[model samples]
Target: RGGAGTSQDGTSKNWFKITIPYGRKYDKAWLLSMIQSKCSVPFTPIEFHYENTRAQFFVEDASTASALKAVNYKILDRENRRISIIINSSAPPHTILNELKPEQVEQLKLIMSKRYDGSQQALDLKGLRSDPDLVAQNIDVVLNRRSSMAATLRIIEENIPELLSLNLSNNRLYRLDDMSSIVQKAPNLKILNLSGNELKSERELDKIKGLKLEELWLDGNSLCDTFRDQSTYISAIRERFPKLLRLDGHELPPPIAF
Candidate 1:
């Protein structure tokens, strides 16, 4: 009975099916109650079919459906066997955007302009989550999100391509893939601060490998704790930014050239 259909709001409904494999059994009422409790959003009742091994349901929005689908392998049967959740949507997955309108871009420019120190050529975008201007407009500049970071980069490239220093501390940046363009946009960048973010490993550093940074800060990230010794940590970071003379506020000996 489950297939593609339009919702009352005209958005297509996403169908999801949960399969309990190997003839594993579970109480229907208990399972239904658990599923309902797991999902924060309300939805139509789930239907059991194919001898109760398969349970199917539909949700009106993509986000809700994606959240529900994340419960795969989390729900278990009486024998503790894992259940699988599969999504069957005829339409391609929707691309959610955090794009800023032209007017909003002007507003962002105003906000950023105040943070720029033209004399020092530094732009401080640290702790953007609490920036009153961004909060008022419900605009998030968290660097972890691709679209939001992309928009911010576009603005920086257009307005301050000659930037020398950028402070992205406390911006919840776990990945820097979208920030790769900064190497081209700000070729003269020599100082960068990424402290107090969610960066988990050095691999994320590879995304911005081309940045010719001289001074860097990564003191407050989880990645720092992963290293056993200070020397090892310094060496690892050096591989990415070979010209680095200062790191986490510590001065290092000059780099030996060939």
Candidate 2:
């Protein structure tokens, strides 16, 4: 789900002020507060009347702490996979808040990008790790590679942590369903980008049983059978990813892109 912004209105006195100047920042304080609060925040999408928004503000209401759901931003450094900036709000630089220093999030992004990299802005979740414990060794990442995914899996199997997602979609992928090697290393993969790859049917796709996936992004690919036909892609995915709540690169036009 790649919606552009988080737009909602609420009285300033009863909410946390999260102002972004660029777009929105994933894994930011407002989102953290929302997850911790298990409620939601009212925010506006970035509207351009002048310069681009480089800072976003979120003022939280102390009384609604329990209702905080999640806070997410629109701005991110995809190369680094971290919230390099927050692109919301309309506050001056002198009043911007730079509080959340999530080195682990940045580090994790760097590592996750060794595969297909990504993020999103969400607030208070029921059982989110407000303070996640990152094991440096648990961050498994690989740079540009040209080899069989079988070999790739073999390389990843050496480490069992540090992996969150995979994007072996747009490659020389022919038939690979049992990625046991990668599965052993990254059992908690939440996102998978398998767009623009070589596939004849759904059988070529990886239907991982143990992967803790929530978002499976598959578009721009050449799969003709699994979807029953070329016209039923969306509904087919809805059937495959029963538990997946968000899939990127599957929408467009902002409001409709989600």
**How high is the CA lDDT of each candidate model?**
0.72, 0.42
Model 1 residue 114 lDDT?
Answer: 89
Candidate 2 C-alpha lDDT tens digits along 1-258? 123323443423233334333333434455344333433554332221222333444433333332322333322345444232232233333344433223433543434334332343111111111113333444322211222234345434444354565555454344446353455666666666655555555544345544656676656555644456533455455445455666655442121223
Assess the local accuracy of residue 74 in candidate 1 as a C-alpha lDDT between 0 and 100: 70
Q: What is every candidate's alpha-carbon RMSD to the true fold?
A: 17.0, 20.5
lDDT value for model 1: 0.72
Model 2 C-alpha lDDT versus the unseen true structure? 0.42
lDDT (10s digit) by residue, model 1, range 131-156: 88778776656667776677778888
Model 2 weakest 10-residue run by lDDT = 121-130
Query: How many clashes in each candidate?
Result: 0, 60
Candidate 1 regions exceeding 4 Å error are 1-98
